[PDB]
Amino acid sequence: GLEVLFQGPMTDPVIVVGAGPTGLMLACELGLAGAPVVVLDRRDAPDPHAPGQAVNAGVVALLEQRGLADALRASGLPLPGAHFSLLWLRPEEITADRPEVGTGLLVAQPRLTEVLEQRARELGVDVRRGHEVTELRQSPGHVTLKLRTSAGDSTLRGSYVVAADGAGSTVRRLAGIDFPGSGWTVSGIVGDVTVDFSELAVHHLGAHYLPAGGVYSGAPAGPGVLRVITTVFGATPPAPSGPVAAEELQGEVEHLTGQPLPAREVLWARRFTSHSGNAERYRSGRVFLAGDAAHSFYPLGGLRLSTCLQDAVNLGWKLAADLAGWAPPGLLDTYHAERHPEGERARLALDAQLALMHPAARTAGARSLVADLARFEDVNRYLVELVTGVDPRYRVGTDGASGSVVPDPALGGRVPGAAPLLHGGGGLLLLGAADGAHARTAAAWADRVGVAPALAADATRSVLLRPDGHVAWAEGSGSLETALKNWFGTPR
Amino acid sequence: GLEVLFQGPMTDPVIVVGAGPTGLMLACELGLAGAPVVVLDRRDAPDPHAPGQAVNAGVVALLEQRGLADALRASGLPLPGAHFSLLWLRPEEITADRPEVGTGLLVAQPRLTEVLEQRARELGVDVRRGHEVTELRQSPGHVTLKLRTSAGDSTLRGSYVVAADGAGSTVRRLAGIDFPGSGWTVSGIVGDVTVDFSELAVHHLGAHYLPAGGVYSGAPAGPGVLRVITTVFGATPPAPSGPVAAEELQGEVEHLTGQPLPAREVLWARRFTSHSGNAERYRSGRVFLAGDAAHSFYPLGGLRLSTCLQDAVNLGWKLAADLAGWAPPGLLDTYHAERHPEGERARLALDAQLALMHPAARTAGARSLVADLARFEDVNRYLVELVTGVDPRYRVGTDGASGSVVPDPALGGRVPGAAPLLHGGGGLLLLGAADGAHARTAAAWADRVGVAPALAADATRSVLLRPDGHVAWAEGSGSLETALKNWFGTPR
Ligand SMILES: Cc1cc2nc3c(=O)[nH]c(=O)nc-3n(C[C@H](O)[C@H](O)[C@H](O)COP(=O)(O)OP(=O)(O)OC[C@H]3O[C@@H](n4cnc5c(N)ncnc54)[C@H](O)[C@@H]3O)c2cc1C
Ligand SMILES: Cc1cc2nc3c(=O)[nH]c(=O)nc-3n(C[C@H](O)[C@H](O)[C@H](O)COP(=O)(O)OP(=O)(O)OC[C@H]3O[C@@H](n4cnc5c(N)ncnc54)[C@H](O)[C@@H]3O)c2cc1C
C-alpha cells in the first residue's frame, strides 16, 4: 500500500510494451506531444546484439524531423547504394530529383536504440526494465496489464496499450490477433566475428546473392568486428533457433562463398528464423500493434526498421491528440487504415525479392527478367523508392479527406526539406505565394498548427503537414479549412 | 537390288527427320532454295491431335515472307491480345509503331502443318511416312541412317541430317547431345470436348491463371469443339503421361475453375509433361537439331512454335548455300551461334513466367511486382515484343560481321514490310535514296541477291536482307560490299 503514497497526481499513461526501436520512437513521439507514457521491457538492459545495420532513408527522414539524425550519423557510414533482391540499382539517377534517397546509413541497431533512449530520458519518459507483460484486460475506459518483475506479480493501468514487443509479440497473442502471411519462412545465422579487415577477400565484404541459392553479408560493426549474416535457402537448419558455434557459422560461410573467414574468434552467433506476417488488425479497442509486432518478414534490406518507425510516428501524435481531447472523430482509426496496407506492401515486397532467389535453379529466369527490366529508368526509380522507404503515400482526397476512394496523388506524401522545421512537433502550414488568406484560416488552429515559409522547406506552394510529416493538403487540392478540420479537429 | 534401277541421277539429300511444323517448314525452305531434301516421319499420317492453337506474330512473319500466311488465316481467328505469365499486356500501345505485333492467330496446329505440307508437295518434296529412324552413323562426307518401316529395316544416305523429331528427339539422343535446363517440369491435360458454346460460363473461355496455383485454357477448335488445357501446379499427377478419361479432365477443370464443363463428350484427352531444355549444341558434324529437338519448355503462349520455325528458316538457306557451293566460310556455324542463345532466351522466359505462378502463395508478391512494373510503357513494350516472338535480333557488327563483340543495334532484326518481296527466296537489297553505287556493288552478287525499292517495303534507307529476312547491313553500318561477302560469299 505504502508504494501509492507521495507520488502525486497521475493521468492514465499510454503503456508501450517493448523498448526496442519501435517502442522508444513511439515514446519519443508521445513525450514530445505531451502525452503521458510508460515504457516496459522484459530485458534487464539494452540488447548489445540487436542485429540490424541497414538504416534506410525512410528511417533517417523520421529521425531528421526530430533532430535525432546527427546523433545516429556519428556512429554510421553513408550507404548510398540500393538493391532489390540483391540486384544493384542506380539511386544516383534520381538523387538530383530526390536527395532523400541517398541518406541511408550503415549503423549498428543498438546505436539507434541508444539515440532514441537518450531522447526519451530527456523528455522524462519512464523506462521500466525487468518488467514482463503476462496478461491484458480491457475495460471501456482503460486497460490493465499483469506484469512480472524479480519482486513478483503486479498490475498497471493505462489509457492505451501499444504492442511494440517484436515479431513474436506477447500482446498480439493476448489480444487474439492473427498474423497471416505467405509461408515464406527463412532461416539464417547472424553473429559478430573478430577479424583483421585487411585480410578479408573482397567476397567477404558487402551483401551477395550466391547463384547456388543463398545470401552472405559481411559488414564492419566496430573496430576489428565483422557482422556476418548467412542464409542457405532450402537447407533445413540443424535447429530453427538457438546459439551457434564457430564451426557452424564457418561451415555456412564456406559453403556459400567457397572460403571460411579469417576469424580470430566468433564473439557471438545465433540461428534466426524469420516469419512472414502482417497482423489482421493493428487496433483492438484500446490495444494497438506497431513495428515487428504488426508485421514481419526476412530482413534483406532496411524495410523492417522503416516500417517500424513509420508506424510509431503515425500513431504517437494521434494517441496524443485523442488523449488531449482535440482529435477529429475517427483519427485513431486512421492508424490501421494507413499503416496496415503499408505493412502488407513491405511484407509482399520481401516475398517478391525472395521469389527471385529460391529455389535458385527455378527462379534464375525471373531474376534475369527483373535485372533486365531494372535497366529502364522508371523501373529503377520504382525499385529504388521502394527499397529506400521513401515511396509511402497515404490515401488522402480533396480537402484532406482521409481514406478517399478518389485519392489526390499530390497528397499523403512528404516534404523532406521541412524536417528541420518540425523538431518542436505539431502540425505545420508551409506558406507559399503560388496561387493573406491561408495564414488567416490557419489562425483558428494556431494551438495545433505552426506556420513557416514554403521556401524554408524547398516547397514551391502552400502545403499542410500533419505532425507525422505527411501532407494533408496543398494549394490546388481543395479547401485548407476543411483539411484543418479533417486532421486537427474543431477551430479554437 | 531392283529398287535401285530406273531412278536416275540423285544428289545426297538433306534428310529431315520429322514432319511436324519444324520439319516441314525446313523442307519448304530447302525446296524453295533448290536443295535436295527428303522428309521422314514415323507416323502413318498427320497427327489430328497436334495440340497447339496460339500462333504468334513471329510465326506469321515467316509464313508471310513465303506467302503461306493467307492459307493459315483462312482457318484462324485474330488473337490481338498478349500476355506474360497470363498477366494481360497492352500490345495496342505499340502496334502503331510495330503493326507486326498484332498479327497473331488462334488456329489449330494441324492446319499449320497442313499448309506447310501442301507447300512442300508443290515444291516436289518427298515425305516418307511410316519411316522411323533407329540409328545414325556419320562419315566425313555424308551421313547414313538406319530406318524401320512395315516392310523392315533399311538404310538412307544424306549430305546432312536435321533432327526435327520433337522434344524427346531420337536424333539428339543418337548424337549424344545433352539437353540441360532449370528443372521446371510441368504436367497438364490437353483434350477436345464437345460443347454448346452458348452454355459456357465466361470463366470456361480464354486462358486464366487461378490464384490457387494452376492454369485453365478453353478455346474453340472447330464447330462444337472446345480445346481445353488444365495444369494444377505442385499436384503430382496420377501418372506423367498417357490417355485421360472424362472424369479426370472434368476433375481438374472443376478443381481449378470451381465448375465442370457442360460437356456432351470428351473426344480425346491426354496427360502431357513438359521438360525445360536447350540442347548444348545445335550442330554435331553433319547433324543439326531444330525445333523442339533443340529446345523445350511449357507451352504457355506461342514461343514454342515461333522458336521452331525461326530455327527452320535460319537453317534452310544456309544448308542450301553450303550444298550449292557459294556459302561463305563458317556460314553453317552461324546456325548454332544465332539460334542456341535464342532457344535459351525463350526457355528462360518460360522459367520466368512459371516462377510468377508456382508455388502460388510464395510467388504472389513477385507476380504483383511484375504486374505493377507492366504499367510502365517501356516494360509493356519489352514484354509484348518478347511474347509475340518479334524481338529476336542477331548479333551482327559493322560491315555485316557475324557474331561481333561490338554488335550494331541497327542490324540483325527484320523489315516486316519486305515480306511480300521475299516469296521467291534469295537475299534482297532494298534500295533507298537516304545518304547509283549500291545497285552497282550488289550486281556482282545478282545470282544470290535481288533488288527492290526500300519504299516498297516501308523502309526509309538501303538495307540488305539475308534469305531468312534478317538484316545483314543498312546504310550507315559500314561497307555493303563487305556485308555481301560475309553472308553471300565471293563475287560472281
Ligand atoms: C539477423 C537480423 C538482421 C536484421 N537486419 C536488419 C537491418 O539491417 N535493417 C533493418 O531495418 N532491420 C533489420 N532487422 C530487423 C530488426 O532487427 C527489427 O525490425 C527490429 O528489432 C524491430 O524492432 P521492434 O522495436 O519492433 O522490436 P524488437 O527490437 O524485437 O524489441 C521488442 C522488445 O519487446 C520486449 N518484449 C517482448 N516481449 C515482452 C513482454 N511480454 N513484456 C515486455 N517486454 C517484452 C523485448 O525485450 C524487446 O526489447 C534484422 C533482423 C534480424 C533478425
Ligand atoms: C498441350 C500442348 C499445347 C501446346 N500449345 C502450343 C501453342 O498454342 N502454341 C505453340 O506455339 N506451341 C504449342 N505447343 C508446342 C507445340 O505443339 C510444339 O512446339 C510443336 O509440335 C513442335 O513441332 P516440331 O515439328 O518441332 O515437333 P513435333 O510436332 O513433335 O513433330 C516431330 C515429328 O517427328 C516424328 N518423329 C519422332 N521421332 C522420330 C523418329 N525416330 N523417326 C522418324 N520420325 C520421328 C514424330 O512422329 C513427329 O511427327 C503445345 C504443346 C503441348 C504439349
PDB file of N, CA, C and O and ligand atoms in Angstrom, chain A residues 17-23 40-43 50-55 109 131-134 164-167 169-171 189-190 229 270 272 274 290-293 299 301-306 308, ligand 1:
ATOM      1  N   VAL A  17       4.675  -1.458 -24.629  1.00  0.00           N
ATOM      2  CA  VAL A  17       5.315  -2.704 -24.262  1.00  0.00           C
ATOM      3  C   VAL A  17       6.418  -3.003 -25.257  1.00  0.00           C
ATOM      4  O   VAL A  17       6.138  -3.429 -26.378  1.00  0.00           O
ATOM      5  N   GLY A  18       7.654  -2.801 -24.795  1.00  0.00           N
ATOM      6  CA  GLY A  18       8.844  -3.050 -25.566  1.00  0.00           C
ATOM      7  C   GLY A  18       9.663  -1.773 -25.717  1.00  0.00           C
ATOM      8  O   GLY A  18       9.110  -0.740 -26.052  1.00  0.00           O
ATOM      9  N   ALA A  19      10.959  -1.859 -25.399  1.00  0.00           N
ATOM     10  CA  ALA A  19      11.888  -0.736 -25.529  1.00  0.00           C
ATOM     11  C   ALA A  19      12.915  -0.977 -26.642  1.00  0.00           C
ATOM     12  O   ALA A  19      14.081  -0.584 -26.548  1.00  0.00           O
ATOM     13  N   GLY A  20      12.475  -1.615 -27.723  1.00  0.00           N
ATOM     14  CA  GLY A  20      13.232  -1.637 -28.957  1.00  0.00           C
ATOM     15  C   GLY A  20      13.018  -0.327 -29.707  1.00  0.00           C
ATOM     16  O   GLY A  20      12.426   0.610 -29.162  1.00  0.00           O
ATOM     17  N   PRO A  21      13.495  -0.263 -30.968  1.00  0.00           N
ATOM     18  CA  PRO A  21      13.366   0.933 -31.806  1.00  0.00           C
ATOM     19  C   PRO A  21      11.928   1.401 -31.947  1.00  0.00           C
ATOM     20  O   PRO A  21      11.689   2.582 -31.798  1.00  0.00           O
ATOM     21  N   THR A  22      10.978   0.471 -32.092  1.00  0.00           N
ATOM     22  CA  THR A  22       9.610   0.912 -32.282  1.00  0.00           C
ATOM     23  C   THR A  22       9.100   1.606 -31.019  1.00  0.00           C
ATOM     24  O   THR A  22       8.533   2.697 -31.071  1.00  0.00           O
ATOM     25  N   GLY A  23       9.236   0.919 -29.862  1.00  0.00           N
ATOM     26  CA  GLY A  23       8.728   1.399 -28.593  1.00  0.00           C
ATOM     27  C   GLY A  23       9.297   2.746 -28.208  1.00  0.00           C
ATOM     28  O   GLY A  23       8.568   3.620 -27.768  1.00  0.00           O
ATOM     29  N   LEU A  40       7.674  -0.341 -20.852  1.00  0.00           N
ATOM     30  CA  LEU A  40       8.066  -1.563 -20.165  1.00  0.00           C
ATOM     31  C   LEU A  40       8.949  -2.396 -21.084  1.00  0.00           C
ATOM     32  O   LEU A  40       8.783  -2.395 -22.306  1.00  0.00           O
ATOM     33  N   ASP A  41       9.865  -3.163 -20.493  1.00  0.00           N
ATOM     34  CA  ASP A  41      10.607  -4.140 -21.255  1.00  0.00           C
ATOM     35  C   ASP A  41      11.090  -5.243 -20.322  1.00  0.00           C
ATOM     36  O   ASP A  41      11.537  -4.953 -19.205  1.00  0.00           O
ATOM     37  N   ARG A  42      10.964  -6.479 -20.807  1.00  0.00           N
ATOM     38  CA  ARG A  42      11.262  -7.685 -20.050  1.00  0.00           C
ATOM     39  C   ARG A  42      12.766  -7.830 -19.842  1.00  0.00           C
ATOM     40  O   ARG A  42      13.175  -8.508 -18.915  1.00  0.00           O
ATOM     41  N   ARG A  43      13.608  -7.202 -20.677  1.00  0.00           N
ATOM     42  CA  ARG A  43      15.053  -7.334 -20.517  1.00  0.00           C
ATOM     43  C   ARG A  43      15.560  -6.455 -19.374  1.00  0.00           C
ATOM     44  O   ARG A  43      14.954  -5.449 -19.032  1.00  0.00           O
ATOM     45  N   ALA A  50      21.524  -6.555 -30.791  1.00  0.00           N
ATOM     46  CA  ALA A  50      20.449  -6.232 -31.722  1.00  0.00           C
ATOM     47  C   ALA A  50      21.090  -6.208 -33.124  1.00  0.00           C
ATOM     48  O   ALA A  50      22.178  -5.672 -33.334  1.00  0.00           O
ATOM     49  N   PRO A  51      20.507  -6.935 -34.090  1.00  0.00           N
ATOM     50  CA  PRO A  51      21.256  -7.335 -35.275  1.00  0.00           C
ATOM     51  C   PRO A  51      21.303  -6.397 -36.476  1.00  0.00           C
ATOM     52  O   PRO A  51      22.085  -6.640 -37.383  1.00  0.00           O
ATOM     53  N   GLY A  52      20.448  -5.379 -36.515  1.00  0.00           N
ATOM     54  CA  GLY A  52      20.312  -4.606 -37.735  1.00  0.00           C
ATOM     55  C   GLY A  52      21.540  -3.729 -37.953  1.00  0.00           C
ATOM     56  O   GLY A  52      22.220  -3.360 -37.001  1.00  0.00           O
ATOM     57  N   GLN A  53      21.840  -3.453 -39.213  1.00  0.00           N
ATOM     58  CA  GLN A  53      22.819  -2.433 -39.556  1.00  0.00           C
ATOM     59  C   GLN A  53      22.364  -1.505 -40.679  1.00  0.00           C
ATOM     60  O   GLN A  53      23.029  -0.510 -40.908  1.00  0.00           O
ATOM     61  N   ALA A  54      21.373  -1.895 -41.470  1.00  0.00           N
ATOM     62  CA  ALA A  54      20.946  -1.076 -42.590  1.00  0.00           C
ATOM     63  C   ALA A  54      19.794  -0.188 -42.123  1.00  0.00           C
ATOM     64  O   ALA A  54      18.715  -0.698 -41.801  1.00  0.00           O
ATOM     65  N   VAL A  55      20.053   1.126 -42.101  1.00  0.00           N
ATOM     66  CA  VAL A  55      19.075   2.133 -41.721  1.00  0.00           C
ATOM     67  C   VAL A  55      18.813   2.987 -42.958  1.00  0.00           C
ATOM     68  O   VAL A  55      19.653   3.789 -43.368  1.00  0.00           O
ATOM     69  N   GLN A 109      22.290  -1.354 -34.998  1.00  0.00           N
ATOM     70  CA  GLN A 109      20.965  -1.134 -34.423  1.00  0.00           C
ATOM     71  C   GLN A 109      21.039  -0.664 -32.970  1.00  0.00           C
ATOM     72  O   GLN A 109      20.277   0.215 -32.598  1.00  0.00           O
ATOM     73  N   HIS A 131      10.518  -5.787 -16.593  1.00  0.00           N
ATOM     74  CA  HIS A 131       9.069  -5.851 -16.470  1.00  0.00           C
ATOM     75  C   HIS A 131       8.474  -6.629 -17.649  1.00  0.00           C
ATOM     76  O   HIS A 131       8.479  -6.154 -18.775  1.00  0.00           O
ATOM     77  N   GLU A 132       7.936  -7.825 -17.396  1.00  0.00           N
ATOM     78  CA  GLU A 132       7.375  -8.672 -18.440  1.00  0.00           C
ATOM     79  C   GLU A 132       5.850  -8.642 -18.374  1.00  0.00           C
ATOM     80  O   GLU A 132       5.250  -8.990 -17.360  1.00  0.00           O
ATOM     81  N   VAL A 133       5.212  -8.290 -19.491  1.00  0.00           N
ATOM     82  CA  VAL A 133       3.769  -8.351 -19.571  1.00  0.00           C
ATOM     83  C   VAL A 133       3.340  -9.809 -19.750  1.00  0.00           C
ATOM     84  O   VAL A 133       3.833 -10.488 -20.660  1.00  0.00           O
ATOM     85  N   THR A 134       2.413 -10.276 -18.879  1.00  0.00           N
ATOM     86  CA  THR A 134       1.921 -11.652 -18.945  1.00  0.00           C
ATOM     87  C   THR A 134       0.419 -11.744 -19.250  1.00  0.00           C
ATOM     88  O   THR A 134      -0.032 -12.762 -19.772  1.00  0.00           O
ATOM     89  N   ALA A 164       4.757  -3.060 -28.806  1.00  0.00           N
ATOM     90  CA  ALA A 164       5.996  -2.839 -29.524  1.00  0.00           C
ATOM     91  C   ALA A 164       6.968  -3.920 -29.099  1.00  0.00           C
ATOM     92  O   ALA A 164       8.179  -3.684 -28.932  1.00  0.00           O
ATOM     93  N   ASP A 165       6.414  -5.126 -28.966  1.00  0.00           N
ATOM     94  CA  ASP A 165       7.147  -6.198 -28.320  1.00  0.00           C
ATOM     95  C   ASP A 165       7.689  -7.217 -29.321  1.00  0.00           C
ATOM     96  O   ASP A 165       7.916  -8.361 -28.957  1.00  0.00           O
ATOM     97  N   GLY A 166       7.907  -6.821 -30.583  1.00  0.00           N
ATOM     98  CA  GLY A 166       8.614  -7.679 -31.509  1.00  0.00           C
ATOM     99  C   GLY A 166       7.750  -8.722 -32.212  1.00  0.00           C
ATOM    100  O   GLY A 166       6.522  -8.787 -32.065  1.00  0.00           O
ATOM    101  N   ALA A 167       8.448  -9.494 -33.053  1.00  0.00           N
ATOM    102  CA  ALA A 167       7.821 -10.310 -34.074  1.00  0.00           C
ATOM    103  C   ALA A 167       7.006 -11.442 -33.442  1.00  0.00           C
ATOM    104  O   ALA A 167       6.000 -11.864 -34.011  1.00  0.00           O
ATOM    105  N   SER A 169       5.331 -11.064 -30.702  1.00  0.00           N
ATOM    106  CA  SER A 169       4.520 -10.268 -29.781  1.00  0.00           C
ATOM    107  C   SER A 169       3.635 -11.058 -28.798  1.00  0.00           C
ATOM    108  O   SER A 169       2.626 -11.642 -29.197  1.00  0.00           O
ATOM    109  N   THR A 170       3.957 -10.947 -27.496  1.00  0.00           N
ATOM    110  CA  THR A 170       3.073 -11.393 -26.416  1.00  0.00           C
ATOM    111  C   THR A 170       1.694 -10.739 -26.528  1.00  0.00           C
ATOM    112  O   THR A 170       0.658 -11.409 -26.474  1.00  0.00           O
ATOM    113  N   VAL A 171       1.684  -9.406 -26.702  1.00  0.00           N
ATOM    114  CA  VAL A 171       0.460  -8.639 -26.718  1.00  0.00           C
ATOM    115  C   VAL A 171      -0.420  -9.022 -27.888  1.00  0.00           C
ATOM    116  O   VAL A 171      -1.634  -9.026 -27.736  1.00  0.00           O
ATOM    117  N   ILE A 189      21.953 -17.478 -39.966  1.00  0.00           N
ATOM    118  CA  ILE A 189      22.800 -17.235 -38.823  1.00  0.00           C
ATOM    119  C   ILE A 189      23.230 -15.777 -38.857  1.00  0.00           C
ATOM    120  O   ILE A 189      23.621 -15.291 -39.913  1.00  0.00           O
ATOM    121  N   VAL A 190      23.184 -15.134 -37.698  1.00  0.00           N
ATOM    122  CA  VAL A 190      23.780 -13.820 -37.511  1.00  0.00           C
ATOM    123  C   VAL A 190      24.793 -13.937 -36.378  1.00  0.00           C
ATOM    124  O   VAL A 190      24.570 -14.692 -35.419  1.00  0.00           O
ATOM    125  N   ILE A 229      25.967 -12.297 -41.721  1.00  0.00           N
ATOM    126  CA  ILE A 229      24.694 -12.992 -41.856  1.00  0.00           C
ATOM    127  C   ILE A 229      24.872 -14.000 -42.982  1.00  0.00           C
ATOM    128  O   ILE A 229      25.397 -13.671 -44.036  1.00  0.00           O
ATOM    129  N   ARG A 270      23.999 -16.599 -33.543  1.00  0.00           N
ATOM    130  CA  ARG A 270      22.729 -17.248 -33.271  1.00  0.00           C
ATOM    131  C   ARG A 270      21.983 -17.563 -34.570  1.00  0.00           C
ATOM    132  O   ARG A 270      22.132 -16.919 -35.609  1.00  0.00           O
ATOM    133  N   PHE A 272      18.550 -17.574 -36.531  1.00  0.00           N
ATOM    134  CA  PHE A 272      17.301 -16.835 -36.518  1.00  0.00           C
ATOM    135  C   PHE A 272      16.369 -17.473 -37.541  1.00  0.00           C
ATOM    136  O   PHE A 272      16.820 -18.103 -38.491  1.00  0.00           O
ATOM    137  N   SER A 274      12.959 -16.124 -39.701  1.00  0.00           N
ATOM    138  CA  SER A 274      12.058 -15.005 -39.934  1.00  0.00           C
ATOM    139  C   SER A 274      10.723 -15.534 -40.434  1.00  0.00           C
ATOM    140  O   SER A 274      10.681 -16.328 -41.363  1.00  0.00           O
ATOM    141  N   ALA A 290       2.352  -2.179 -33.205  1.00  0.00           N
ATOM    142  CA  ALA A 290       3.307  -1.419 -34.004  1.00  0.00           C
ATOM    143  C   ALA A 290       4.632  -2.161 -34.141  1.00  0.00           C
ATOM    144  O   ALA A 290       5.029  -2.940 -33.280  1.00  0.00           O
ATOM    145  N   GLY A 291       5.338  -1.862 -35.247  1.00  0.00           N
ATOM    146  CA  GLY A 291       6.623  -2.465 -35.552  1.00  0.00           C
ATOM    147  C   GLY A 291       6.482  -3.956 -35.842  1.00  0.00           C
ATOM    148  O   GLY A 291       5.530  -4.383 -36.497  1.00  0.00           O
ATOM    149  N   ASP A 292       7.476  -4.727 -35.402  1.00  0.00           N
ATOM    150  CA  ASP A 292       7.547  -6.133 -35.730  1.00  0.00           C
ATOM    151  C   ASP A 292       6.321  -6.861 -35.188  1.00  0.00           C
ATOM    152  O   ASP A 292       5.996  -7.928 -35.696  1.00  0.00           O
ATOM    153  N   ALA A 293       5.690  -6.320 -34.138  1.00  0.00           N
ATOM    154  CA  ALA A 293       4.500  -6.972 -33.597  1.00  0.00           C
ATOM    155  C   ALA A 293       3.386  -6.924 -34.631  1.00  0.00           C
ATOM    156  O   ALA A 293       2.489  -7.746 -34.591  1.00  0.00           O
ATOM    157  N   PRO A 299      14.761  -9.904 -43.148  1.00  0.00           N
ATOM    158  CA  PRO A 299      15.435  -8.605 -43.229  1.00  0.00           C
ATOM    159  C   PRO A 299      16.545  -8.514 -44.274  1.00  0.00           C
ATOM    160  O   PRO A 299      17.734  -8.477 -43.978  1.00  0.00           O
ATOM    161  N   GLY A 301      16.955  -6.023 -46.561  1.00  0.00           N
ATOM    162  CA  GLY A 301      17.359  -4.623 -46.655  1.00  0.00           C
ATOM    163  C   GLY A 301      17.003  -3.861 -45.364  1.00  0.00           C
ATOM    164  O   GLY A 301      17.309  -4.338 -44.263  1.00  0.00           O
ATOM    165  N   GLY A 302      16.373  -2.682 -45.499  1.00  0.00           N
ATOM    166  CA  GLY A 302      16.033  -1.806 -44.381  1.00  0.00           C
ATOM    167  C   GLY A 302      14.530  -1.573 -44.174  1.00  0.00           C
ATOM    168  O   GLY A 302      14.168  -0.713 -43.352  1.00  0.00           O
ATOM    169  N   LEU A 303      13.657  -2.338 -44.844  1.00  0.00           N
ATOM    170  CA  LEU A 303      12.221  -2.081 -44.699  1.00  0.00           C
ATOM    171  C   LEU A 303      11.686  -2.502 -43.319  1.00  0.00           C
ATOM    172  O   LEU A 303      10.632  -2.040 -42.916  1.00  0.00           O
ATOM    173  N   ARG A 304      12.361  -3.388 -42.593  1.00  0.00           N
ATOM    174  CA  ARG A 304      11.865  -3.724 -41.259  1.00  0.00           C
ATOM    175  C   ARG A 304      11.860  -2.496 -40.358  1.00  0.00           C
ATOM    176  O   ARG A 304      10.821  -2.087 -39.836  1.00  0.00           O
ATOM    177  N   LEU A 305      13.015  -1.839 -40.226  1.00  0.00           N
ATOM    178  CA  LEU A 305      13.079  -0.683 -39.352  1.00  0.00           C
ATOM    179  C   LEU A 305      12.280   0.503 -39.909  1.00  0.00           C
ATOM    180  O   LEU A 305      11.758   1.276 -39.113  1.00  0.00           O
ATOM    181  N   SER A 306      12.211   0.702 -41.244  1.00  0.00           N
ATOM    182  CA  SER A 306      11.465   1.833 -41.727  1.00  0.00           C
ATOM    183  C   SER A 306       9.974   1.625 -41.488  1.00  0.00           C
ATOM    184  O   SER A 306       9.338   2.577 -41.008  1.00  0.00           O
ATOM    185  N   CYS A 308       8.685  -0.092 -39.040  1.00  0.00           N
ATOM    186  CA  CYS A 308       8.619   0.064 -37.590  1.00  0.00           C
ATOM    187  C   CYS A 308       8.470   1.524 -37.169  1.00  0.00           C
ATOM    188  O   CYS A 308       7.551   1.901 -36.427  1.00  0.00           O
TER     189      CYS A 308
HETATM  190  C1  LIG C   1      19.667 -11.060 -38.325  1.00  0.00           C
HETATM  191  C2  LIG C   1      18.755  -9.862 -38.489  1.00  0.00           C
HETATM  192  C3  LIG C   1      19.232  -8.773 -39.182  1.00  0.00           C
HETATM  193  C4  LIG C   1      18.461  -7.612 -39.339  1.00  0.00           C
HETATM  194  N1  LIG C   1      18.988  -6.555 -40.054  1.00  0.00           N
HETATM  195  C5  LIG C   1      18.178  -5.512 -40.246  1.00  0.00           C
HETATM  196  C6  LIG C   1      18.669  -4.369 -40.912  1.00  0.00           C
HETATM  197  O1  LIG C   1      19.817  -4.296 -41.338  1.00  0.00           O
HETATM  198  N2  LIG C   1      17.817  -3.299 -41.048  1.00  0.00           N
HETATM  199  C7  LIG C   1      16.551  -3.319 -40.604  1.00  0.00           C
HETATM  200  O2  LIG C   1      15.812  -2.394 -40.944  1.00  0.00           O
HETATM  201  N3  LIG C   1      16.059  -4.365 -39.882  1.00  0.00           N
HETATM  202  C8  LIG C   1      16.874  -5.379 -39.675  1.00  0.00           C
HETATM  203  N4  LIG C   1      16.398  -6.445 -38.949  1.00  0.00           N
HETATM  204  C9  LIG C   1      15.075  -6.332 -38.338  1.00  0.00           C
HETATM  205  C10 LIG C   1      15.189  -5.511 -37.000  1.00  0.00           C
HETATM  206  O3  LIG C   1      16.158  -6.024 -36.056  1.00  0.00           O
HETATM  207  C11 LIG C   1      13.835  -5.474 -36.297  1.00  0.00           C
HETATM  208  O4  LIG C   1      12.836  -4.979 -37.229  1.00  0.00           O
HETATM  209  C12 LIG C   1      13.726  -4.584 -35.054  1.00  0.00           C
HETATM  210  O5  LIG C   1      14.447  -5.111 -33.927  1.00  0.00           O
HETATM  211  C13 LIG C   1      12.283  -4.398 -34.652  1.00  0.00           C
HETATM  212  O6  LIG C   1      12.212  -3.511 -33.541  1.00  0.00           O
HETATM  213  P1  LIG C   1      10.967  -3.551 -32.556  1.00  0.00           P
HETATM  214  O7  LIG C   1      11.167  -2.435 -31.612  1.00  0.00           O
HETATM  215  O8  LIG C   1       9.650  -3.636 -33.252  1.00  0.00           O
HETATM  216  O9  LIG C   1      11.119  -4.992 -31.814  1.00  0.00           O
HETATM  217  P2  LIG C   1      12.351  -5.621 -31.004  1.00  0.00           P
HETATM  218  O10 LIG C   1      13.612  -4.884 -31.360  1.00  0.00           O
HETATM  219  O11 LIG C   1      12.193  -7.084 -31.082  1.00  0.00           O
HETATM  220  O12 LIG C   1      12.043  -5.170 -29.486  1.00  0.00           O
HETATM  221  C14 LIG C   1      10.902  -5.737 -28.778  1.00  0.00           C
HETATM  222  C15 LIG C   1      11.123  -5.526 -27.303  1.00  0.00           C
HETATM  223  O13 LIG C   1       9.961  -6.042 -26.591  1.00  0.00           O
HETATM  224  C16 LIG C   1      10.432  -6.714 -25.431  1.00  0.00           C
HETATM  225  N5  LIG C   1       9.405  -7.657 -25.028  1.00  0.00           N
HETATM  226  C17 LIG C   1       8.993  -8.761 -25.713  1.00  0.00           C
HETATM  227  N6  LIG C   1       8.001  -9.380 -25.120  1.00  0.00           N
HETATM  228  C18 LIG C   1       7.761  -8.628 -23.967  1.00  0.00           C
HETATM  229  C19 LIG C   1       6.870  -8.782 -22.887  1.00  0.00           C
HETATM  230  N7  LIG C   1       5.974  -9.759 -22.805  1.00  0.00           N
HETATM  231  N8  LIG C   1       6.864  -7.827 -21.931  1.00  0.00           N
HETATM  232  C20 LIG C   1       7.775  -6.844 -22.006  1.00  0.00           C
HETATM  233  N9  LIG C   1       8.695  -6.626 -22.942  1.00  0.00           N
HETATM  234  C21 LIG C   1       8.625  -7.560 -23.906  1.00  0.00           C
HETATM  235  C22 LIG C   1      11.771  -7.319 -25.809  1.00  0.00           C
HETATM  236  O14 LIG C   1      12.633  -7.485 -24.701  1.00  0.00           O
HETATM  237  C23 LIG C   1      12.355  -6.262 -26.762  1.00  0.00           C
HETATM  238  O15 LIG C   1      13.268  -5.378 -26.120  1.00  0.00           O
HETATM  239  C24 LIG C   1      17.179  -7.579 -38.753  1.00  0.00           C
HETATM  240  C25 LIG C   1      16.697  -8.697 -38.055  1.00  0.00           C
HETATM  241  C26 LIG C   1      17.483  -9.811 -37.893  1.00  0.00           C
HETATM  242  C27 LIG C   1      16.904 -10.968 -37.121  1.00  0.00           C
END
